[PDB]
Protein backbone atom coordinates (compact mmCIF):
# COMPACT_ATOMS: atom_id res chain seq x y z
CA UNK A 1 0.00 0.00 0.00
CA UNK A 2 0.77 3.70 -0.48
CA UNK A 3 0.20 6.56 1.97
CA UNK A 4 -3.36 7.97 2.04
CA UNK A 5 -1.63 11.26 1.29
CA UNK A 6 1.88 11.29 -0.14
CA UNK A 7 1.43 15.07 -0.10
CA UNK A 8 2.02 17.33 2.91
CA UNK A 9 -0.40 20.02 4.03
CA UNK A 10 -0.92 20.38 7.78
CA UNK A 11 1.29 19.87 10.80
CA UNK A 12 3.03 17.06 8.94
CA UNK A 13 4.38 19.63 6.47
CA UNK A 14 5.77 21.70 9.34
CA UNK A 15 7.31 18.56 10.85
CA UNK A 16 9.00 17.72 7.55
CA UNK A 17 10.31 21.29 7.24
CA UNK A 18 11.81 21.00 10.74
CA UNK A 19 13.30 17.60 9.83
CA UNK A 20 14.95 18.60 6.52
CA UNK A 21 16.36 21.83 7.98
CA UNK A 22 17.20 20.78 11.49
CA UNK A 23 18.19 23.89 13.38
CA UNK A 24 18.74 25.87 10.14
CA UNK A 25 15.16 27.17 10.14
CA UNK A 26 12.74 27.57 7.21
CA UNK A 27 10.11 29.80 5.62
CA UNK A 28 6.59 28.91 4.46
CA UNK A 29 6.86 31.69 1.89
CA UNK A 30 9.33 31.80 -1.02
CA UNK A 31 10.76 35.16 0.11
CA UNK A 32 12.26 35.15 3.62
CA UNK A 33 11.04 38.71 4.31
CA UNK A 34 11.93 40.49 7.59
CA UNK A 35 8.49 40.92 9.15
CA UNK A 36 6.96 37.79 10.64
CA UNK A 37 3.29 38.74 10.25
CA UNK A 38 0.42 36.21 10.42
CA UNK A 39 0.06 36.67 6.65
CA UNK A 40 3.08 35.18 4.84
CA UNK A 41 3.59 35.14 1.08
CA UNK A 42 2.79 32.05 -1.02
CA UNK A 43 5.28 29.17 -1.09
CA UNK A 44 5.72 25.63 0.25
CA UNK A 45 2.00 24.75 0.35
CA UNK A 46 1.72 25.23 -3.42
CA UNK A 47 4.28 22.57 -4.24
CA UNK A 48 3.76 20.06 -1.40
CA UNK A 49 -0.02 20.25 -0.82
CA UNK A 50 -1.65 21.61 -3.99
CA UNK A 51 0.95 19.55 -5.85
CA UNK A 52 3.40 16.84 -4.84
CA UNK A 53 7.01 17.70 -4.03
CA UNK A 54 10.31 15.98 -3.20
CA UNK A 55 12.58 16.64 -0.21
CA UNK A 56 15.13 18.24 -2.57
CA UNK A 57 12.57 20.78 -3.80
CA UNK A 58 11.26 21.20 -0.27
CA UNK A 59 14.73 22.09 1.05
CA UNK A 60 14.76 25.16 -1.24
CA UNK A 61 12.24 26.73 1.19
CA UNK A 62 14.74 26.23 4.03
CA UNK A 63 16.59 29.28 5.36
CA UNK A 64 19.87 27.74 4.16
CA UNK A 65 20.54 24.86 1.72
CA UNK A 66 21.73 21.31 2.41
CA UNK A 67 24.83 20.96 4.58
CA UNK A 68 25.20 17.28 3.77
CA UNK A 69 28.46 17.24 1.79
Which among 26, 15, 20, 12 has a CA at the least distance from the CA of 61?
A: 26
Q: How many helices (H) and strands (E) does the chain have?
A: 3, 0
DSSP secondary structure, 21-32, as one string: HGGG-B-SBSS-
The backbone region for 2, taken as left when phi is positive above 0, alpha when psi lies in -120 to 50, beta otherwise, is beta
Which domains can be identified in the chain, with CATH numbers? 1-69 (1.10.100.10)
Q: Give the method used.
A: NMR
Tell me how far apart the alpha carbons of residues 31 and 28 are, in angstroms, rounded to a whole number: 9
The length of the chain, given as a count of residues = 69
Amino acid sequence: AYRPSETLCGGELVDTLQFVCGDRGFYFSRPASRVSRRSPQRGIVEECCFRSCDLALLETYCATPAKSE
